[PDB]
Amino acid sequence: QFRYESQLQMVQVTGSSDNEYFYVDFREYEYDLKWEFPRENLEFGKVLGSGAFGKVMNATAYGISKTGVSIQVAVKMLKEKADSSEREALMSELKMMTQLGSHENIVNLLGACTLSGPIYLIFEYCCYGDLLNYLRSKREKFSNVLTFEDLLCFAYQVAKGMEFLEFKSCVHRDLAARNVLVTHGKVVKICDFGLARDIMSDSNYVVRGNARLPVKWMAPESLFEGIYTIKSDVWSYGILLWEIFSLGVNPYPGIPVDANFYKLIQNGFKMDQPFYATEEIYIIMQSCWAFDSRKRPSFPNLTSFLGCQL
Numbered sequence: 590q591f592r593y594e595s596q597l598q599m600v601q602v603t604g605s606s607d608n609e610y611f612y613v614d615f616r617e618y619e620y621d622l623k624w625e626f627p628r629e630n631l632e633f634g635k636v637l638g639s640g641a642f643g644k645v646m647n648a649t650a651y652g653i654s655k656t657g658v659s660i661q662v663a664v665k666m667l668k669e670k671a672d673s674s675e676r677e678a679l680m681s682e683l684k685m686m687t688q689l690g691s692h693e694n695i696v697n698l699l700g701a702c703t704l705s706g707p708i709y710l711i712f713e714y715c716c717y718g719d720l721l722n723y724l725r726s727k728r729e730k731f732s733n734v735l736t737f738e739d740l741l742c743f744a745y746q747v748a749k750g751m752e753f754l755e756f757k758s759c760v761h762r763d764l765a766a767r768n769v770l771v772t773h774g775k776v777v778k779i780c781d782f783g784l785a786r787d788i789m790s791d792s793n794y795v796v797r798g799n800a801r802l803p804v805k806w807m808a809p810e811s812l813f814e815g816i817y818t819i820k821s822d823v824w825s826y827g828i829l830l831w832e833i834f835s836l837g838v839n840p841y842p843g844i845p846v847d848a849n850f851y852k853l854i855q856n857g858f859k860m861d862q863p864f865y866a867t868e869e870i871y872i873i874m875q876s877c878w879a880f881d882s883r884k885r886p887s888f889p890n891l892t893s894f895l896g897c898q899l
């Protein structure tokens with residue numbers, strides 16, 4: 590039956606073809622105890638989001654960043670059933686995130702509570718929420734004012750975050766604006782929000798046996814062969830660029846997810862230039878949607894092309 594899995598995954602390449610890799614599993618690796626934080630020092634707030642397996646909650650953490658100082662954090666946890674398989678899925682995400690290291694454009698792990706109670710993973714709080722809702726909130730406030738350089742900066746930062754994950758040998762299997770968070774200074778951060786989401790919350794995911802597939806964000810090789818590489822993420826990134834430069838419009842607007850959608854993608858269908866994009870930004874998008882993954886740009890390339898335009 591269906592299990593919890595972070596959409597952030599470490600991988601190891603075993604050859605030079607796209608399907609020659611496997612997924613790194615931390616279940617047999619040991620958890621580093623220097624990350625352990627006392628549960629007594631967490632004061633819980635609202636539910637940020639709730640899924641089938643668990644939820645993410647706002648909280649106040651005493652002494653996590655500096656001595657004597659309370660800050661706001663976000664806490665992943667399981668729901669009370671506490672099935673032991675789901676427990677280890679969440680330990681594996683913990684161990685994985687402890688090995689990543691931090692980066693400005695990733696929602697970083699701060700600590701965890703694992704010994705005297707139910708498992709908590711503790712993350713940086715991002716006050717303005719997911720990028721998708723943020724962009725949508727600012728449709729009637731675009732020149733609280735949102736400008737074109739802000740949009741370009743968001744694009745640059747997400748690419749920067751993905752460069753980090755590439756260099757650390759990770760992929761994100763669900764890169765989209767709903768999984769990017771916004772915080773002070775127009776700063777954006779890639780996260781894995783999957784534990785806080787359901788099938789009721791989202792029609793952008795298609796049920797298919799065990800899988801829950803974000804079809805309109807997926808590269809052809811992901812859709813047709815089940816392959817997720819960093820070049821798949823470049824496709825997804827293109828789709829996320831379209832989201833940014835339309836202020837959060839659903840991709841392939843008005844087109845439903847069905848067998849005809851699979852055919853569109855197979856035959857080379859690509860979205861049009863959205864309102865807030867320049868022609869140069871649309872040329873970037875279009876090359877992210879190269880059918881052949883070798884023709885797509887890399888995240889170092891995109892970090893340059895968008896370092897320039899700023």
Ligand SMILES: COc1cc2ncc(-c3ccccn3)n2cc1-c1cnn(C)c1
Nearest residue numbers: 637638663712713714715718719781782
């Ligand atoms: C205030 O909104 C947030 C703030 C926030 N800060 C951290 C996180 C988070 C989410 C997942 C994993 C790790 N961290 N987080 C999530 C949200 C959030 C809640 N709902 N939506 C749509 C975004």
Ligand SMILES: [Cl-]
Nearest residue numbers: 596781782783
């Ligand atoms: Cl996710």
Ligand SMILES: [Cl-]
Nearest residue numbers: 767786790791
């Ligand atoms: Cl959501």
Ligand SMILES: [Cl-]
Nearest residue numbers: 786787794801
């Ligand atoms: Cl989902």
